[PDB]
Amino acid sequence: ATGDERFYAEHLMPTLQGLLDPESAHRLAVRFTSLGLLPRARFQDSDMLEVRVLGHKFRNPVGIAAGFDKHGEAVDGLYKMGFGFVEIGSVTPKPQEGNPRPRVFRLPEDQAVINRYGFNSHGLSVVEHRLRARQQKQAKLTEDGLPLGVNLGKNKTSVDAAEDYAEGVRVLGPLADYLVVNVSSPNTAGLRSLQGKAELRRLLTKVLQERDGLRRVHRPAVLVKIAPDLTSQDKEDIASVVKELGIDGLIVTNTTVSRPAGLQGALRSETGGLSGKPLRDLSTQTIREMYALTQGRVPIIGVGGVSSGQDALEKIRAGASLVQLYTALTFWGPPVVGKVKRELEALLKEQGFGGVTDAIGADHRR
Numbered sequence: 452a453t454g455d456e457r458f459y460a461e462h463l464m465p466t467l468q469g470l471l472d473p474e475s476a477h478r479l480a481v482r483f484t485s486l487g488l489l490p491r492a493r494f495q496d497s498d499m500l501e502v503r504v505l506g507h508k509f510r511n512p513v514g515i516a517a518g519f520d521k522h523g524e525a526v527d528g529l530y531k532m533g534f535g536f537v538e539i540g541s542v543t544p545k546p547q548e549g550n551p552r553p554r555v556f557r558l559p560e561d562q563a564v565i566n567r568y569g570f571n572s573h574g575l576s577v578v579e580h581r582l583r584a585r586q587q588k589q590a591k592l593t594e595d596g597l598p599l600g601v602n603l604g605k606n607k608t609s610v611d612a613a614e615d616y617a618e619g620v621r622v623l624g625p626l627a628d629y630l631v632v633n634v635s636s637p638n639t640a641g642l643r644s645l646q647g648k649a650e651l652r653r654l655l656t657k658v659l660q661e662r663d664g665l666r667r668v669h670r671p672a673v674l675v676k677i678a679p680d681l682t683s684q685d686k687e688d689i690a691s692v693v694k695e696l697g698i699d700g701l702i703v704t705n706t707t708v709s710r711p712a713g714l715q716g717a718l719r720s721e722t723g724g725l726s727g728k729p730l731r732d733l734s735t736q737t738i739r740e741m742y743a744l745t746q747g748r749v750p751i752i753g754v755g756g757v758s759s760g761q762d763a764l765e766k767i768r769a770g771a772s773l774v775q776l777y778t779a780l781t782f783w784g785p786p787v788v789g790k791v792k793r794e795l796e797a798l799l800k801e802q803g804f805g806g807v808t809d810a811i812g813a814d815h816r817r
């Protein structure tokens with residue numbers, strides 16, 4: 452453990468979170484990150500953390516999940532934290548305010564958060580201009596193993612969900628290494644019903660035709676991000692559609708609308724998606740089931756409750772090629788990124804893996 456990891460986790464983050472409302476803490480974090488007001492990322496990425504997937508090199512397999520940088524304001528600062536890849540969004544076609552405040556709740560006793568932001572978004576036009584300002588900087592970052600993902604959502608009042616996603620592909624597809632069709636927010640009425648077989652096949656056919664229409668150097672991978680709350684039937688149907696259409700990957704999982712037994716936080720019964728420690732194993736077991744249903748042939752980005760190298764390696768061994776985190780950053784701060792990478796490298800060596808690639812899906816081969 453570095454001096455910074457202990458100071459941030461034991462003193463600085465609890466002090467700052469105790470002084471700020473949770474949404475004010477989020478907004479300030481995006482500000483600090485965009486300005487590069489960050490502790491030194493001491494950790495040097497080794498060859499054994501490199502992953503080749505989704506048509507790209509990833510210098511390390513630890514990404515920032517969607518929701519932290521919804522509007523693409525802090526991308527360069529997130530690479531400066533030591534993330535191997537950055538995902539921005541969700542972005543909606545038109546700007547929208549999201550839900551009324553309060554809409555994000557801390558459960559420190561559970562190392563969890565509940566949010567009901569409701570896709571607060573600057574909209575595609577603003578994010579398009581923000582990414583265009585650094586488009587060639589991003590091309591050089593991607594070539595250097597630091598890809599960019601863009602997560603697409605839909606407007607609250609949209610009548611045609613598929614047209615909202617198509618508009619996102621058109622506008623931000625040319626600026627992205629991968630796109631995410633986010634059909635798993637718990638905080639937009641009817642959105643999760645787009646995970647159903649008939650609705651998903653129609654939606655994803657339209658998204659893939661739009662993506663295929665982009666010029667080659669501007670043609671991103673397309674991933675579907677799924678809920679942790681799916682039935683066995685829902686998961687079987689998603690696996691079938693992903694293989695039928697040649698979807699490039701899955702992000703597993705979004706936040707849960709479940710409230711696992713044992714939550715202690717006073718705010719446990721707030722409406723919204725639960726993230727952090729209580730989601731971790733529900734996410735890992737969703738990765739495990741989606742890897743099996745897709746015969747290990749569909750790359751998975753594993754997300755939900757990662758705050759250590761062990762958490763990351765459990766998702767990799769379950770079938771994830773890459774992992775993301777968000778909620779751990781609210782408790783540990785920026786040093787968590789180097790912490791997870793150092794612990795993951797040590798565990799790969801201890802368990803006899805040559806690198807991350809050798810560990811992907813290893814549990815299925817036992």
Ligand SMILES: CCn1c(CO)nn(-c2cc3c(C(C)C)nn(-c4ccccc4C)c(=O)c3cc2F)c1=O
Nearest residue numbers: 467468473476477479480483484488780781784785
């Ligand atoms: C879920 C909403 N949500 C919450 C509330 O649940 N917190 N949160 C958050 C806050 C912070 C904060 C603030 C405490 C100032 N600061 N820093 C930091 C510290 C020192 C130096 C450089 C930075 C960016 C972080 O990294 C950081 C990350 C975060 F995710 C965040 O997105």
Ligand SMILES: Cc1cc2nc3c(=O)[nH]c(=O)nc-3n(C[C@H](O)[C@H](O)[C@H](O)COP(=O)(O)O)c2cc1C
Nearest residue numbers: 516517518540541566705726727755756776777778
């Ligand atoms: C405040 C907050 C906002 C989020 N917003 C989004 C979003 O816009 N799009 C999305 O696909 N996921 C969103 N998520 C979900 C995260 O990307 C992630 O799937 C989930 O929080 C589990 O990871 P974690 O336990 O490491 O936070 C959000 C999560 C949080 C905590």
Ligand SMILES: O=C(O)c1cc(=O)[nH]c(=O)[nH]1
Nearest residue numbers: 568569570636638706724
């Ligand atoms: O905007 C939000 O409320 C949001 C979107 C999403 O996909 N997941 C989440 O937990 N919140």
Ligand SMILES: [Cl-]
Nearest residue numbers: 503504505506
């Ligand atoms: Cl590849």
Ligand SMILES: [Cl-]
Nearest residue numbers: 473555556557
């Ligand atoms: Cl709170």
Ligand SMILES: [Cl-]
Nearest residue numbers: 576577579580
């Ligand atoms: Cl425009």
Ligand SMILES: [Cl-]
Nearest residue numbers: 586625626669
């Ligand atoms: Cl372009």
Ligand SMILES: [Cl-]
Nearest residue numbers: 659660663697
């Ligand atoms: Cl295609």
Ligand SMILES: [Cl-]
Nearest residue numbers: 681682683684
């Ligand atoms: Cl079921």
Ligand SMILES: [Cl-]
Nearest residue numbers: 708709710711
């Ligand atoms: Cl429940």
Ligand SMILES: [Cl-]
Nearest residue numbers: 708721722723
């Ligand atoms: Cl809820």
